[PDB]
Amino acid sequence: PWHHIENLDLFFSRVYNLHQKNGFTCMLIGEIFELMQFLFVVAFTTFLVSCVDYDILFANKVTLPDAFLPAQVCSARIQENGSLITILVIAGVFWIHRLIKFIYNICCYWEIHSFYLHALRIPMSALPYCTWQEVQARIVQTQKEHQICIHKRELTELDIYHRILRFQNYMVALVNKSLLPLRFRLPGLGEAVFFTRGLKYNFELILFWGPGSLFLNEWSLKAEYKRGGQRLELAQRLSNRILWIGIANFLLCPLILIWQILYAFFSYAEVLKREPGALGARCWSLYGRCYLRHFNELEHELQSRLNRGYKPASKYMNCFLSPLLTLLAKNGAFFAGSILAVLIALTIYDEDVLAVEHVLTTVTLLGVTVTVCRSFIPDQHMVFCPEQLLRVILAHIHYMPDHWQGNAHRSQTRDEFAQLFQYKAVFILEELLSPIVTPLILIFCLRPRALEIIDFFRNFTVEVVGVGDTCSFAQ
Amino acid sequence: PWHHIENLDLFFSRVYNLHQKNGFTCMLIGEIFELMQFLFVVAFTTFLVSCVDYDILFANKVTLPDAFLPAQVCSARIQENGSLITILVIAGVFWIHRLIKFIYNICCYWEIHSFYLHALRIPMSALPYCTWQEVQARIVQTQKEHQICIHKRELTELDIYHRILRFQNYMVALVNKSLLPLRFRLPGLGEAVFFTRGLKYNFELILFWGPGSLFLNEWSLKAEYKRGGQRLELAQRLSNRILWIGIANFLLCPLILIWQILYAFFSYAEVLKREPGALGARCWSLYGRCYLRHFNELEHELQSRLNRGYKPASKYMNCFLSPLLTLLAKNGAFFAGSILAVLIALTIYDEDVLAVEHVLTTVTLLGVTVTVCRSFIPDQHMVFCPEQLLRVILAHIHYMPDHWQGNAHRSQTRDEFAQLFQYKAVFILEELLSPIVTPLILIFCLRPRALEIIDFFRNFTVEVVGVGDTCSFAQ
Amino acid sequence: PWHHIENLDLFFSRVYNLHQKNGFTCMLIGEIFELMQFLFVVAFTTFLVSCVDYDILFANKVTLPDAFLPAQVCSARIQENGSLITILVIAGVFWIHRLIKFIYNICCYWEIHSFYLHALRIPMSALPYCTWQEVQARIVQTQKEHQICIHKRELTELDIYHRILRFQNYMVALVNKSLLPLRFRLPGLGEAVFFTRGLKYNFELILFWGPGSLFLNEWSLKAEYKRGGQRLELAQRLSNRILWIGIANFLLCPLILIWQILYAFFSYAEVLKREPGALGARCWSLYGRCYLRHFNELEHELQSRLNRGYKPASKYMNCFLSPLLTLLAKNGAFFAGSILAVLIALTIYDEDVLAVEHVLTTVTLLGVTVTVCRSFIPDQHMVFCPEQLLRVILAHIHYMPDHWQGNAHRSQTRDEFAQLFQYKAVFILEELLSPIVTPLILIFCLRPRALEIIDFFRNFTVEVVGVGDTCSFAQ
């Protein structure tokens, strides 16, 4: 808690993260688990590929370790694979980089832990329940005693929001003003939205944190971008930068594709074998987490709003009528139940129904038919609230398309309310497709917008006295 | 969309019906299905009786069509049945009358379609979805351009209600003022209420639409009924009319009993076969639909109120349970669970406790016993205030007997709240008994009330300027 | 229905009990079942111990009665057991005492049954629904025509309350003013609360109903306890009385432990084998039934309040979960589901990786592991630990520690709301430990308080004109 011992943002963000991952110990364990998952996916995969003798395992009493080959041979069998050794070297370099960042991160988090205990006085035991609210108000009271910022008024913390959410307000305003290509017109489908984890990572790596980004400090925009002139040369430089970052993405495509493959397998294939309908449930759509966001909104406030409003949204996706069918169901149930009631009364009367070549099969098929129809027959006295569903979901979200409020029941509303609330399976598919799709969108659809991106960052970037360079809307 | 081509009722009612059966294509299909159900019931009703050789089917590998007799013989075997041929001729005449009415109805519904599309501008695609208010908001605004009927009155915004519900407000006021015999004092039972579909049909055929009814136009009462004098001769004429309509009912009794027999038997029994407890669920009744109904209330508003308030009413009807049985359940569970715990501890200890002469059956039977008892044991901590709940049922239904609010928990309240809420099975029984019961109630219990019916229709019938002759209460 | 003939407290109490056990027949059956449960536990246990030949039953087709020994030998084998015969003689003496008390209990209850039928006019059929308020209204209206009570004073509807609840108001005020040792400071745990069924029985046997209690009549305090002087000799006498009652408890310890050890094992061992999580549900804690209870509150009013407020309290107790445990669950689910997905893909591919003598078992195990973790993984929402959940639990019960309202989310609040919420396993454990714990608390922790108990009963005991000697608070 040394005074002005650092820029405000890399300190405040860490403080917030420590509050979120409830405490230093929890956070440390979480990071360690995150590192062990990567290493386990890679090592389990390379063990399955390289060391196991599938033939003996399958056909040719056999104990499990009868399959595995001895290490003195596994090392040679994995080493004589140029492709495998190359993938493992790149994987190990990424891993070592992540482990080094982890060590540096915990050495910097012990400082935030001491900050809490000694200057905020919130022990790690009282932290899962201390509440964000407690600390955010509290630090502001600490600003008097344990001084921070060389020249600082007590933190309104309004600013503090700004520190934690500087680049996220920029993403919110970029997506809000329709820069950043998301909408695509696919043949055979409507206008798809393709916004993933990797794509937003690339957008932030291009714009905010890198070698030659728009920002030099993490709290100050480079000096040329504030100048009205020379906009065209800056646009050309940004276009070339994003071209080469897209080409790096295109070259790293195979490795990230392989990664998205295995982790998912383990992550989902289990769920598929258990409950194949868990992937039919719907999730709140990375595009949609950025669309339904609200000014200077920390992650936990957005997620509280998003799950307060989740069950109304599932009831909506669930609700619409399909009425003509209903009639087909009712009448098919009538005719099938009639023929089945006759055949059932006969088989009850004499019990020699059998020996008819198709009888028994007829009773079974008719039973299936009646059950399907009765499932399609709506339950009577089942209430319907189209108006309410397109009202309570909004009450939890607070943002709406202006052409949804009237026609809540149409396919236009469902089709674009779907993208915001889209189902897990298309989420897993869309995260699989991002390695192969992100470079081409990055090269083709964003490079034309570079001159508009430059004008955004020149026009909408205010210098607020305490915080530095923040988005103009987030004020 | 033309001007006053047909009675407003014969136009407004059709418009409303087209909105309800969501669209012309739906309406047609529904009517066609309604015609095919009648013909299908009667067909087999006659194929099962006449063409199938049950002896060969039962006992004397046999393919299904080994039972059926060739048509060249089925025609002769069905033709040499005077009773069957007579029932079929009457059935075919009723059918042809219904088919002719259907053709005329769709030829008149196309006109209405065109009304929607061209003057209201609501396509059949946006209709299931139009919503009631909007049509209301459309028809009344249209009254300016495509002028409505006489156009005498601009739309009242009540006028349409009176037009659609003229005779139904009369039924509501008749049942509300205790004309129209419903209560009966059966021996061995309390005061039963017998109000069916056929009985209300007969009441409307007697009073409203017929050769010599009270009404001549469908919107104007005959001129003599407005006169105070000659009430006694009018009462005698009405009594003779209802006598002869009751005698027509008594003569048609066998056929409606059969049809009631045939159409019902097929449907419900299979369901019982499937789930015999579906007939233990309770439905609102023709009565009760007429008791809880406001005056100018379209069918969909009543049904919305009736199913909003259905689950509270089922929670009420299921709330009273025997104290004594509970005790038997608790103690049978104790003794069975004790013997089973001993036998389970033994089979766990040695595992050869099993394979004993009674071993693999006592544990199973005791498990079934404990499960049945635990199902009969009420849930401790279960909160039921019978008295409190009726409150929510009232908040939905909106009407009640005064002597219910205090004693919500007695057998008097349940017994006559039972009548409003009776379970399906007594509904199906009560619709079966109506062919044989409706003529005798119609001849004996209503003919004495004819002089009160005449005084009702003379006293409570107002002439409203735009709509004609409407009930006096429905104002 | 006699003219104020026998001590009132008892007559009214019996009347109330007859209303509770809904009717004479029900009550009689309940008591008979209570007597048969004791005899069945004892006889089944002595049959299992003494008559069954376990060796033949286990190993050495065998019919069940091949195990049992003939009675001519069972009698000799049970008789040559001094310990067993002694326990059986004490058990039979307690039983005969209970059967004799039951006899009259019913000979005195036929009088209350005749009271109902002839003076209150509530048949036993209308009694499960007659309700308390009306009866109260019936008894108080009956007071006039038919003589009852001294007649010095007419009933006033609170007299009946004092009569039924004289000693229970004393218990409420004793526990409310922190006499009666309940809080203990165990090493390795917080301050435990140990209040059981046997402990409260002993407190009432010491204070209220016995040979030398504080009360001589059941409605009048002995004359010396009202005197300010001689308090020290009275304190010494009370201390000696409670010493010797504690020593009787210590000597009866083995027998009550046996029954407690016994009955309990039998009672929940069945439930354990069925649903091991039924013992994880929580119950309302004998301490807590006495803490949350108003003064003049009959048992059914307290229990109505206690179950109206049960589900809010379970929602509170389940709302706080360890994040760490959450993280361990998430990551154990990941690693187990990964290994299982691999093994499942193999057994699907070839089917001879299936039922690897080792694999099939693990697959299940791993399946058990994934299911346990997924049960520990939180699902969305329910994380509030809200002021609001408390704000409804309080609205039910109406009493909370004052340091609860602010910090509803801390471990201090959960830990001492925990004591009120009583998860059952502990109940069953705490009812098992009471035979061995009640004598030592009774000898050591209560005997020092005897001088404060004497001062309580001298200071807080008012003589109300109609009822006698009642607690001073219950006014």
From Swiss-Prot, chains A, B, C:
Modifications after synthesis and translation: Ufmylated in a DDRGK1 dependent manner.
Paired cysteines (S-S): none
Non-spanning membrane segments, not crossing the bilayer: 243-253, 272-280, 423-432, 436-444
Chain segments annotated as transmembrane: 27-49, 81-106, 324-349, 359-376
Membrane topology field: Multi-pass membrane protein
Consequence when changing residue 371 to W: Strongly reduced lipid scramblase activity and autophagy
Side Cytoplasmic, residues: 107-242, 254-271, 281-323, 377-422, 433-435
Primary residence: membrane
Residue intervals on the Lumenal side: 50-80, 350-358
Catalytic activity: a 1,2-diacyl-sn-glycero-3-phosphocholine(in) = a 1,2-diacyl-sn-glycero-3-phosphocholine(out); a 1,2-diacyl-sn-glycero-3-phospho-L-serine(in) = a 1,2-diacyl-sn-glycero-3-phospho-L-serine(out); a 1,2-diacyl-sn-glycero-3-phosphoethanolamine(in) = a 1,2-diacyl-sn-glycero-3-phosphoethanolamine(out)
Keyword ATP-binding: no
GO molecular function: phospholipid scramblase activity
GO annotation terms (biological process): autophagosome assembly; bone morphogenesis; innate immune response; mitophagy; negative regulation of interferon-beta production; negative regulation of macrophage cytokine production; piecemeal microautophagy of the nucleus; programmed necrotic cell death
Subcellular location: Preautophagosomal structure membrane; Cytoplasmic vesicle, Autophagosome membrane; Golgi apparatus, trans-Golgi network membrane; Late endosome membrane
Source organism, top-level taxon: Eukaryota
Key words of the record: Acetylation, Autophagy, Cytoplasmic vesicle, Endoplasmic reticulum, Endosome, Glycoprotein, Golgi apparatus, Lipid transport, Membrane, Mitochondrion, Phosphoprotein, Transmembrane, Transmembrane helix, Transport, Ubl conjugation
A GO cellular component annotation in the UniProt record: Golgi apparatus
Known role: Phospholipid scramblase involved in autophagy by mediating autophagosomal membrane expansion. Cycles between the preautophagosomal structure/phagophore assembly site (PAS) and the cytoplasmic vesicle pool and supplies membrane for the growing autophagosome. Lipid scramblase activity plays a key role in preautophagosomal structure/phagophore assembly by distributing the phospholipids that arrive through ATG2 (ATG2A or ATG2B) from the cytoplasmic to the luminal leaflet of the bilayer, thereby driving autophagosomal membrane expansion.
Quaternary structure, from the entry: Homotrimer; forms a homotrimer with a central pore that forms a path between the two membrane leaflets. Interacts (via cytoplasmic its C-terminus) with ATG2A. Interacts with SUPT20H. Interacts (via the tyrosine-based sorting signal motif) with AP4M1; promoting association with the AP-4 complex. Interacts with ARFIP1 and ARFIP2. Interacts with PI4K2A and PI4KB. Interacts with ATG4A; the interaction is direct and promotes ATG9A trafficking.
Domain note: Forms a homotrimer with a solvated central pore, which is connected laterally to the cytosol through the cavity within each protomer. Acts as a lipid scramblase that uses its central pore to function: the central pore opens laterally to accommodate lipid headgroups, thereby enabling lipid flipping and redistribution of lipids added to the outer leaflet of ATG9A-containing vesicles, thereby enabling growth into autophagosomes.
UniProt similarity note: Belongs to the ATG9 family.
Name of the protein: Autophagy-related protein 9A
Organism: Homo sapiens (Human)
Complete-protein stretch covered: 36 to 523 of 839
